[PDB]
Write a protein that binds this ligand. Structure first.
Ligand SMILES: Nc1nc(-c2cc(Br)cc3ccoc23)c2nc[nH]c2n1
Length: 127
């Protein structure tokens, strides 16, 4: 029933890079999903106490959300595109694992995921 600490968004000894792919992940991918009418349940970590989801963190062991991804991108937390891409996939997958097929939250994740795929399809070549 209690909330874990959020995922890490700062770590001084973690290696990191600023790259055209990671810039595309922020400027195009994150920006496009963030603005969407279904973005709101995905803009911060799930609060299991406020939402009354006491099982959430007994089921979801690698939590992820766009608030976390946004801070990672803004704070140049990543080494490569694939790390960031994995965070999005974890976010969508957790939603489908926890929630009941057909629930509104699943339909919202599905709309964001469709856009995500369309945008990562055009991930630019590394420079
Ligand atoms: N059942 C459920 N609710 C939510 C969810 C619902 C509501 Br109202 C507001 C917020 C803000 C973070 O989370 C929210 C989820 N966000 C991601 N997966 C979620 N699964």
């Amino acid at each position: 029933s209690m909330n874990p600490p959020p995922p890490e968004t700062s770590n001084p000894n973690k290696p990191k890079r600023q790259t055209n792919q990671l810039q595309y992940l922020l400027r195009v991918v994150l920006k496009t999903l963030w603005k969407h009418q279904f973005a709101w349940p995905f803009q911060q970590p799930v609060d299991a106490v406020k939402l009354n989801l006491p099982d959430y963190y007994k089921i979801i062991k690698t939590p992820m959300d766009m608030g976390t991804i946004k801070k990672r991108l803004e704070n140049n937390y990543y080494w490569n595109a694939q790390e960031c891409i994995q965070d999005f996939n974890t976010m969508f997958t957790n939603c489908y694992i926890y929630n009941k097929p057909g629930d509104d939250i699943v339909l919202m994740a599905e709309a964001l995921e469709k856009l995500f795929l369309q945008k990562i399809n055009e991930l630019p070549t590394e420079e």
